[PDB]
Amino acid sequence: LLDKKWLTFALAIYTVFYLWVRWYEGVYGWSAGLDSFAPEFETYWMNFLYTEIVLEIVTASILWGYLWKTRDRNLAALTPREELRRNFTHLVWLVAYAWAIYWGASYFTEQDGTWHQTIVRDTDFTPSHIIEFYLSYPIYIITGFAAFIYAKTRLPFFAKGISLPYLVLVVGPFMILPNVGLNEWGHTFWFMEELFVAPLHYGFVIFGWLALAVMGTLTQTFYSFAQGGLGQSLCE
Amino acid sequence: LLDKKWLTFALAIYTVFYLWVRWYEGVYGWSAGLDSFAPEFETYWMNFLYTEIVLEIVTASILWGYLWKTRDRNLAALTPREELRRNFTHLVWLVAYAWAIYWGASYFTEQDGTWHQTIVRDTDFTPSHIIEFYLSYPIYIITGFAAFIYAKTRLPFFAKGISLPYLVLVVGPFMILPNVGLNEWGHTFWFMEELFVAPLHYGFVIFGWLALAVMGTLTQTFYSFAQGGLGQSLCE
Amino acid sequence: HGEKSQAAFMRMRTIHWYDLSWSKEKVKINETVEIKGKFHVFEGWPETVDEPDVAFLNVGMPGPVFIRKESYIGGQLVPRSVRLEIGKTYDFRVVLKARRPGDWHVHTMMNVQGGGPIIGPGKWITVEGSMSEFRNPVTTLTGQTVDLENYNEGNTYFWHAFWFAIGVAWIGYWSRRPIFIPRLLMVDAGRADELVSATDRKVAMGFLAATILIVVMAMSSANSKYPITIPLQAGTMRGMKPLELPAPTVSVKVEDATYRVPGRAMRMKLTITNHGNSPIRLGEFYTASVRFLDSDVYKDTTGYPEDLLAEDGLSVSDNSPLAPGETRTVDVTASDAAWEVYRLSDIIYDPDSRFAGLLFFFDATGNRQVVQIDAPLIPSFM
Amino acid sequence: SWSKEKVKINETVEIKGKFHVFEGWPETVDEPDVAFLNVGMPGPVFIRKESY
Amino acid sequence: ITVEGSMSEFRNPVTTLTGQTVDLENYNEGNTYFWHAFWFAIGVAWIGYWS
Amino acid sequence: AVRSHAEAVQVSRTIDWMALFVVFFVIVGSYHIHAMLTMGDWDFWSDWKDRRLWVTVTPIVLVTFPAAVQSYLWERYRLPWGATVCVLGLLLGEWINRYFNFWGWTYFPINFVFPASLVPGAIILDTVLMLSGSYLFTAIVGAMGWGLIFYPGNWPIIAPLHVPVEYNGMLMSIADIQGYNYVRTGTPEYIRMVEKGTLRTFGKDVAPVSAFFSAFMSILIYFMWHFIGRWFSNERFLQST
Amino acid sequence: VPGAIILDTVLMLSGSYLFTAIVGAMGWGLIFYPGNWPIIAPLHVPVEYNGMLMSIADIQGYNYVRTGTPEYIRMVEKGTLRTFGKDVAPVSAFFSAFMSILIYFMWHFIGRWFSNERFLQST
Ligand SMILES: CCCCCCCCCCCC(=O)OC[C@H](COP(=O)(O)OCC[N+](C)(C)C)OC(=O)CCCCCCCCCCC
Ligand SMILES: CCCCCCCCCCCC(=O)OC[C@H](COP(=O)(O)OCC[N+](C)(C)C)OC(=O)CCCCCCCCCCC
Ligand SMILES: CCCCCCCCCCCC(=O)OC[C@H](COP(=O)(O)OCC[N+](C)(C)C)OC(=O)CCCCCCCCCCC
Ligand SMILES: CCCCCCCCCCCC(=O)OC[C@H](COP(=O)(O)OCC[N+](C)(C)C)OC(=O)CCCCCCCCCCC
Ligand SMILES: CCCCCCCCCCCC(=O)OC[C@H](COP(=O)(O)OCC[N+](C)(C)C)OC(=O)CCCCCCCCCCC
Numbered sequence A, B: 001l002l003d004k005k006w007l008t009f010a011l012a013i014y015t016v017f018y019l020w021v022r023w024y025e026g027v028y029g030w031s032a033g034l035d036s037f038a039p040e041f042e043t044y045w046m047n048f049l050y051t052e053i054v055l056e057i058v059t060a061s062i063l064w065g066y067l068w069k070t071r072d073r074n075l076a077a078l079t080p081r082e083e084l085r086r087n088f089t090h091l092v093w094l095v096a097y098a099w100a101i102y103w104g105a106s107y108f109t110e111q112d113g114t115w116h117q118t119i120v121r122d123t124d125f126t127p128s129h130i131i132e133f134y135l136s137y138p139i140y141i142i143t144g145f146a147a148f149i150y151a152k153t154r155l156p157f158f159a160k161g162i163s164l165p166y167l168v169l170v171v172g173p174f175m176i177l178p179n180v181g182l183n184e185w186g187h188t189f190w191f192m193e194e195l196f197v198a199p200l201h202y203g204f205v206i207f208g209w210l211a212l213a214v215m216g217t218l219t220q221t222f223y224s225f226a227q228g229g230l231g232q233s234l235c236e
Numbered sequence C: 001h002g003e004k005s006q007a008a009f010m011r012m013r014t015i016h017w018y019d020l021s022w023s024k025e026k027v028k029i030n031e032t033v034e035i036k037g038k039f040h041v042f043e044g045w046p047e048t049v050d051e052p053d054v055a056f057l058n059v060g061m062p063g064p065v066f067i068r069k070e071s072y073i074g075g076q077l078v079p080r081s082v083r084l085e086i087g088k089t090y091d092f093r094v095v096l097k098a099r100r101p102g103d104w105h106v107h108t109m110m111n112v113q114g115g116g117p118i119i120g121p122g123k124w125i126t127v128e129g130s131m132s133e134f135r136n137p138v139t140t141l142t143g144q145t146v147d148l149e150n151y152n153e154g155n156t157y158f159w160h161a162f163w164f165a166i167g168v169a170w171i172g173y174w175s176r177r178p179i180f181i182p183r184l185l186m187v188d189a190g191r192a193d194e195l196v197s198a199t200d201r202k203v204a205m206g207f208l209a210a211t212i213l214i215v216v217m218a219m220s221s222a223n224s225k226y227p228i229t230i231p232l233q234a235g236t237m238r239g240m241k242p243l244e245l246p247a248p249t250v251s252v253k254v255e256d257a258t259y260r261v262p263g264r265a266m267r268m269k270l271t272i273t274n275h276g277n278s279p280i281r282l283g284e285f286y287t288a289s290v291r292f293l294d295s296d297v298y299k300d301t302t303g304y305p306e307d308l309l310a311e312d313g314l315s316v317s318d319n320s321p322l323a324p325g326e327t328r329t330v331d332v333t334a335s336d337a338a339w340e341v342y343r344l345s346d347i348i349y350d351p352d353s354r355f356a357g358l359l360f361f362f363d364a365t366g367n368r369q370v371v372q373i374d375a376p377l378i379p380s381f382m
Numbered sequence D: 001s002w003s004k005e006k007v008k009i010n011e012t013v014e015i016k017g018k019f020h021v022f023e024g025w026p027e028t029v030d031e032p033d034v035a036f037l038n039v040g041m042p043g044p045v046f047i048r049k050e051s052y
Numbered sequence E: 001i002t003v004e005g006s007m008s009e010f011r012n013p014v015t016t017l018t019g020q021t022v023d024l025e026n027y028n029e030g031n032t033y034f035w036h037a038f039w040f041a042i043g044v045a046w047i048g049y050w051s
Numbered sequence F: 001a002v003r004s005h006a007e008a009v010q011v012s013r014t015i016d017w018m019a020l021f022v023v024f025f026v027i028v029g030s031y032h033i034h035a036m037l038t039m040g041d042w043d044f045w046s047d048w049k050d051r052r053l054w055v056t057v058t059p060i061v062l063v064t065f066p067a068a069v070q071s072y073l074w075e076r077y078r079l080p081w082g083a084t085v086c087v088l089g090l091l092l093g094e095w096i097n098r099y100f101n102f103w104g105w106t107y108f109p110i111n112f113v114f115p116a117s118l119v120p121g122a123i124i125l126d127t128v129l130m131l132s133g134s135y136l137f138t139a140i141v142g143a144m145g146w147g148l149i150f151y152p153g154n155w156p157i158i159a160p161l162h163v164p165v166e167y168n169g170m171l172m173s174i175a176d177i178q179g180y181n182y183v184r185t186g187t188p189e190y191i192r193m194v195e196k197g198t199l200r201t202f203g204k205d206v207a208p209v210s211a212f213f214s215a216f217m218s219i220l221i222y223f224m225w226h227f228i229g230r231w232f233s234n235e236r237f238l239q240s241t
Numbered sequence G: 001v002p003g004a005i006i007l008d009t010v011l012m013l014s015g016s017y018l019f020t021a022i023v024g025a026m027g028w029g030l031i032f033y034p035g036n037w038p039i040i041a042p043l044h045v046p047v048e049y050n051g052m053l054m055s056i057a058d059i060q061g062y063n064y065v066r067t068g069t070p071e072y073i074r075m076v077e078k079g080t081l082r083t084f085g086k087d088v089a090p091v092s093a094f095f096s097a098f099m100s101i102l103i104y105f106m107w108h109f110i111g112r113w114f115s116n117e118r119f120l121q122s123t
């Protein structure tokens, strides 16, 4: 069996959900989405924030909780074949994390490289944010943690000591969300324009660099992959 | 024989060539050297740049090439006496490198501390540059590399692994030339004056610090000097 | 010499120099040459340059071939940087004393705090004699007359040679014993404490004490001799009296301006309205150090530089006398080899294709009027 | 002008006058684009009731 | 302000000094696409070669 | 191999002279480039040798090289003249350019383009190092001395250029008149970073305060450049650049 | 793409990271503007637009209104008094080529640190 069809679903959900997200914001940009003090904006964008903030917190607790609850207690007694399967499942988790990273740190963020370049900031909770900062960022942050927790609770060798690179690749990108306070404070205060290369932004840049720990994570995952079923084949 | 009269020539060529260089620029500063758009400036200063840029590239290839071609293949079978000779030859190379460093990083550069303090920058290829940036800097860069290559191909113990200090003392000072892009971009853009302590200049300063690796190079050369014929005498 | 390389549009719209005059063309050593004229700060100051809040009246020359005896903005001396107001007109006067023989290109430039050097027209001045004859006498308030060519030179040399000597002695003292390899081996192989033993420490203490005592005694001696000293005098000078020019009676509107690429001519269409009560006529057009003149109206007698002067470079389609009150539109073409020699046709490479200049209108009685024109400059290729 | 030379506690003293900004402003100081009318005294011995 | 019609009817004609009239809605679009696709193709080939 | 003990000594002597030449000229070149691009402007012009900016910035940016060269030479050979050799090399290069270029190429007077004296500071820095081996002591004390003795060391030279003169109704010093006369086309009067006086300049404390500020800053610069010179004195091998 | 290719080739070709940082970075910085010239070239044709000289790109920016991006925010070449002849593009290219050397040198070690494989056992 090994690598199953869980990866297909992983890529599907994000794509599907994010595809509808673009459709929503695409149909609710102008009109009851432009004016942030209108009554229709609280019904189409204010409600979205609330709803998405609750679901994210709920899902996170459940996902992380369930993953940590079913954690393997007897890792020592784990057959190589089984380990391989778990390694493939963790690779599927990493693929889902990579997909969510792209969507949240590339699309919706540059999808934003546009909204502002067209409309004046009405409030700290504009349509694009109700999509980028508070939906896609928590979604990938959730996936990131999930992947990390799974690797430390299932697969052997990735446990018994938090992996530095993995921790940096899961927390580094997770720090961008809170930095939203920075650029907001940037906008609201220092800087009255729309420059995208302003400092009150290097905050995402600094913690966007921490996503480069994916290289250490992937070599660590390779080593874990090449534990029992590393050969042969490889160097043979 | 040991230390021969190659050192005398080493100090002579640079002095002689640089002495005539000052005479040239001294006779061609004002008149067909001031106006950068005059027809006489392309015959006395534009031609100099071209000519010197070709000779530098040609000589470098030949010098470095020849030095790397006659590299000692059987370093293991090298008598101590012979090694000493090669160490003295490398010390002569280091003396030539030090002389070229002084001429390029002290004289012509401060010789420039003057031209500007007297005339307005006509173009990026003014007389002093046709002497400092594109002649003396490539000359010392050539000597530097030559000295490094010679030490790594002749003398024992300086090979089998690039010497950090030596590499930093040969590449550190070599980075100043390219930084010329910086101060130019400084002048042309940020800064409309003639201040010599401006930032678009710390570029030479940063890579001028890397010439302090000469201390590590010289202690490494001492150790190499005190390999077989280190005594005695020394501590005896 | 330093111009022709700057952007043509910025050279056109920064400072317009006119009424320039040079007292002498050929001078002996120690003789004085006076440069006079007026400069007007353009209202349309390029946004890339800082405003002339801090400006210095400099002179463009190859080194110190001429010493700046005096320099005046208006009627008051200006040895330091001054504040200039955009849109105002000032008259200047620079006095130069010949120091180095040869042929030099003297420019009356202006240095803005953050906008580069604004070089004006340059005139060739010949200096004859010998540099050894140059004298720069100056009387101090202490009651002593000293030459600025060799004052304090001896004293400067002595002190530097004295210290360099001390430094050499220090290094020389330790340089008598073997320096690098045995000391390195001694420091390495086992403990050191043998290369630095008394009386070496005694010598170092003597050196330190002697250095401190010599510095203190030299300061005390330099405080007794020359007991009266003042700090360096510096600071931007405000309140620069501008010229009180009378409002021009001639209004000019620029309706499109074109220049051929490539070419040596600039064409513009002007609607000139003559107010007041006198028949006027366009006689000159100054853009950037280049004067296009209509020989049928005005002739230059101030010895303007030949390479910057166009005797008949200004052509007007209808240059008949303009009756007062009458308004008419004419085509004006300024053509001279100087529009290419000074790279005035290199404004196409500039990121701001706009020009500025001065038009001089003269009446029958000979009195002239200065009006300013600025408009976008559109290149033409086909 | 000073309204009073000797005052009791809680009494009011009024200081009036004119000040002229010199045209030849020293280049070392910034122009009074942002200026505050303060009072020079050793601590809060007098409370600034009003300033005009 | 109410706008009626279709976006496909919009035209933005502009005459250059070179003597040519081009629309600003699709000028250089084809050329822009070609060059980007051309380079992206080269990059893919490079990575593909080692892939 | 070497042959005997006699030859060894001679060969060692020869190497000494050659090594000294290499170290001296490599430092002169680097130091000069560093010195001239961080304080050169003030060291160029007598009318630039003021009491606040020159005295402040020159020792701070001039102690860099001496600190590193001391940290290497003293530690490896017990040779207490790193600061002195750095200062002498900088002075030699500067004087060479002052005479052959500033007064050679162009015709600027020597009494106008003379450099600053830094020997006394170098001496103090070396003595306080040999005398009192601790690098910490030298960084705190010798740096204090280097910063404090700069202006008094140069006072005998610039003193005579500070005599007041009535020049066309305006009060100017001799150095000010020199700068006004000998025209610097690329160096306008406003570029001169010199003491202009503020509203918080109490009495006569410009020279001492600036001197003390430079003395403190030089402590930190020496402390940092000691470790910089240690790193530059490393002797590692790579085997692949 | 061209810069990326040069950076990779000069690395594979010539293994030394030092060489790549000095040469491949030079190539990456220098080939940027020539690589984009075929694309932006056509947008630089001069146009007579209501009496003012504007390029095609300038007219595009003037037309398609960017409410959050005013004309003054545009950090573009405006020309100074120390801009001699035609050297804006080459000098800027050379300045970028030099800066890229330093950035590559620093980010090589940054990537090394990010490629570390240590374990903590307690965050
Ligand atoms: C890992 C943690 C992830 C958790 C994040 C989930 C955030 C949920 C988003 C809140 C929606 C909102 O904003 O509001 C909810 C909106 C209110 O909009 P309305 O004006 O009533 O329009 C009517 C709603 N239509 C226009 C969408 C019909 O209606 C809804 O309920 C319907 C939204 C369902 C979206 C699910 C489709 C996804 C496709 C299949 C992929 C699963
Ligand atoms: C221990 C180290 C931590 C220190 C950090 C503390 C935050 C500093 C707060 C500054 C307040 C101040 O000092 O002054 C506030 C000044 C006053 O300017 P203004 O006259 O109102 O200008 C008016 C211009 N407006 C209208 C646009 C404001 O506004 C500023 O220029 C803000 C400068 C930005 C500083 C924050 C940078 C944060 C770095 C983030 C990169 C990851
Ligand atoms: C390690 C790599 C080093 C390579 C660098 C070499 C750069 C060469 C410089 C280009 C010269 C130039 O600029 O042009 C060449 C000039 C053009 O000038 P002209 O107007 O014709 O005047 C006539 C030339 N006179 C005025 C010099 C006579 O004429 C020449 O050929 C003669 C220059 C020969 C200089 C060699 C003398 C050195 C003394 C002995 C030391 C070897
Ligand atoms: C990953 C890190 C690399 C970052 C480096 C990238 C280069 C930065 C380019 C700045 C462009 C910009 O941001 O704006 C450009 C601003 C706009 O100012 P202006 O209104 O035209 O001022 C007019 C004043 N003139 C007429 C003199 C221009 O000009 C500047 O003030 C330039 C500031 C200098 C920044 C470069 C420092 C390089 C450090 C070198 C030390 C070794
Ligand atoms: C044997 C050991 C005992 C010696 C103790 C020394 C006594 C102090 C002498 C004061 C000088 C003086 O007299 O005044 C100070 C003169 C001012 O001069 P003025 O304008 O005339 O001020 C007249 C006003 N009075 C009359 C009240 C004095 O300069 C200075 O502000 C020096 C400022 C230096 C501040 C930085 C100091 C940092 C210290 C760092 C610690 C290592």
Ligand SMILES: CCCCCCCCCCCC(=O)OC[C@H](COP(=O)(O)OCC[N+](C)(C)C)OC(=O)CCCCCCCCCCC
Pocket: C212, C215, C216, C219, C223, C229, F051, F124, F144, F145, F148, F149, F151, F152, F204, F205, F206, F207, F208, F209, F211, F212
């Ligand atoms: C090992 C350390 C050795 C230090 C040797 C110091 C020599 C003394 C110089 C006298 C200073 C002077 O005379 O007054 C101060 C003058 C400034 O005067 P001015 O503003 O130019 O006035 C011009 C009119 N003149 C010519 C009369 C001056 O010089 C200075 O600013 C340097 C001040 C540094 C002195 C600090 C010494 C305090 C003790 C150090 C304690 C830890």
Ligand SMILES: CCCCCCCCCCCC(=O)OC[C@H](COP(=O)(O)OCC[N+](C)(C)C)OC(=O)CCCCCCCCCCC
Pocket: B036, B037, B042, B046, B049, B050, B053, B054, B057, B123, B124, B125, B177, B178, B180, B181, B184, G084, G085, G086, G087, G090, G091, G094
């Ligand atoms: C086979 C090897 C030999 C090739 C040697 C190349 C010859 C040089 C050609 C000069 C170009 C030219 O011609 O001028 C330069 C053109 C200016 O153009 P302009 O306005 O017409 O200037 C006309 C004025 N003239 C007629 C006198 C030329 O651009 C530039 O300023 C380029 C500025 C780049 C400066 C940064 C360089 C940093 C180098 C870094 C080291 C790695």
Ligand SMILES: CCCCCCCCCCCC(=O)OC[C@H](COP(=O)(O)OCC[N+](C)(C)C)OC(=O)CCCCCCCCCCC
Pocket: G006, G026, G027, G030, G031, G033, G034, G086, G087, G088, G089, G090, G091, G093, G094
């Ligand atoms: C491995 C390295 C490969 C590098 C490949 C370089 C391709 C050559 C491009 C020609 C440049 C040009 O044609 O002129 C310069 C033009 C700027 O022109 P503009 O101001 O926009 O004028 C507009 C009018 N046009 C359309 C006619 C231009 O482009 C540049 O500024 C890039 C300059 C970088 C060239 C540096 C090459 C020097 C050799 C490198 C040595 C170590």
Ligand SMILES: CCCCCCCCCC(=O)OC[C@H](COP(=O)(O)OCC[N+](C)(C)C)OC(=O)CCCCCCCCC
Pocket: F128, F131, F132, F133, F134, F137
């Ligand atoms: C608590 C801080 C107060 C200041 C003390 C800091 C000095 C510490 C330096 C240090 O670590 O010791 C190095 C030498 C050791 O030499 P010793 O063999 O201890 O010599 C002792 C005899 N002596 C008094 C003449 C020195 O000893 C010395 O460095 C010299 C000691 C004499 C003090 C004066 C020297 C400095 C002159 C400016």
Ligand SMILES: CCCCCCCCCC(=O)OC[C@H](COP(=O)(O)OCC[N+](C)(C)C)OC(=O)CCCCCCCCC
Pocket: B167, B168, B171, B172, F236, F237, F238, F239, F240, F241, G017, G018
């Ligand atoms: C401006 C800042 C000053 C520059 C000083 C930085 C020097 C950094 C040290 C360094 O270069 O590390 C070299 C390693 C490659 O190691 P190796 O080649 O395996 O050498 C084995 C021994 N060693 C690991 C200790 C080096 O890392 C590498 O990948 C090789 C790169 C070497 C480049 C160093 C040359 C610096 C010249 C400017």
Ligand SMILES: CCCCCCCCCC(=O)OC[C@H](COP(=O)(O)OCC[N+](C)(C)C)OC(=O)CCCCCCCCC
Pocket: B064, B145, F240, F241, G010, G013, G014, G015, G016, G019
């Ligand atoms: C003194 C500085 C002058 C420049 C030299 C810097 C290059 C140093 C790089 C290095 O450390 O060596 C790595 C390889 C080793 O391969 P080798 O097995 O030595 O191959 C030799 C045959 N060859 C000439 C085709 C290469 O050798 C190479 O890197 C390639 C050598 C060929 C030079 C041209 C390659 C660069 C192309 C842009």
Ligand SMILES: CCCCCCCCCC(=O)OC[C@H](COP(=O)(O)OCC[N+](C)(C)C)OC(=O)CCCCCCCCC
Pocket: A167, A168, A171, A172, G118, G119, G120, G121, G122, G123
């Ligand atoms: C923005 C800057 C980039 C962040 C990179 C900084 C990483 C610093 C390295 C580090 O975290 O050290 C961990 C030690 C705790 O050590 P231990 O948990 O005892 O691990 C034993 C092995 N070890 C000592 C080598 C780690 O120190 C600790 O007390 C634990 C703190 C670990 C936090 C690292 C997570 C960084 C995520 C942003």
Ligand SMILES: CCCCCC(=O)OC[C@H](COP(=O)(O)OCC[N+](C)(C)C)OC(=O)CCCCC
Pocket: A022, A023, A024, A026, A027
């Ligand atoms: C790898 C990221 C793909 C992002 C594609 C995207 O944003 O799609 C939205 C866009 C919307 O434009 P359009 O297709 O015309 O449909 C408009 C519907 N709204 C306005 C809701 C987006 O086009 C599509 O839906 C194409 C489907 C691509 C599947 C990978």
Ligand SMILES: CCCCCC(=O)OC[C@H](COP(=O)(O)OCC[N+](C)(C)C)OC(=O)CCCCC
Pocket: A190, A191, A192, A193, A199
């Ligand atoms: C890593 C490079 C950081 C350079 C910071 C920068 O570009 O700041 C520009 C800004 C100059 O403000 P400006 O660009 O004129 O802003 C114009 C718009 N307002 C006035 C509203 C802020 O300077 C500051 O306020 C200090 C920045 C501290 C950085 C740690």
Ligand SMILES: CCCCCC(=O)OC[C@H](COP(=O)(O)OCC[N+](C)(C)C)OC(=O)CCCCC
Pocket: B022, B023, B024, B026, B027, F096, F100, F104
């Ligand atoms: C250690 C660096 C020596 C630099 C000396 C220098 O630049 O010499 C040029 C200068 C030129 O002045 P001068 O001797 O009067 O001859 C003028 C000839 N030109 C104008 C061509 C320089 O003086 C000399 O030629 C003296 C020879 C010194 C030999 C070490």
Ligand SMILES: CCCCCC(=O)OC[C@H](COP(=O)(O)OCC[N+](C)(C)C)OC(=O)CCCCC
Pocket: B190, B191, B192, B193, B199, C113, C114, C115
């Ligand atoms: C290590 C110290 C670096 C301090 C930088 C500095 O002194 O910059 C002065 C300059 C202030 O410009 P200013 O001196 O007023 O320049 C006047 C001349 N113009 C206007 C032509 C540039 O500030 C900047 O533009 C930012 C420098 C960033 C350094 C990484």
Ligand SMILES: CCCCCCCCCC
Pocket: F224, F225, F227, F228, F230, F231
């Ligand atoms: C800012 C000074 C830092 C100097 C670096 C020294 C590192 C030494 C490691 C062996």
Ligand SMILES: CCCCCCCCCC
Pocket: G106, G107, G109, G110, G112, G113
């Ligand atoms: C500014 C670049 C510094 C990168 C840090 C790398 C540290 C490696 C330690 C193992």
Ligand SMILES: [Cl-]
Pocket: A112, A183
């Ligand atoms: Cl953002």
Ligand SMILES: [Cl-]
Pocket: B112, B183
């Ligand atoms: Cl330089």
Ligand SMILES: [Cu+2]
Pocket: A112, A116, A126, A128, A129
């Ligand atoms: Cu946003």
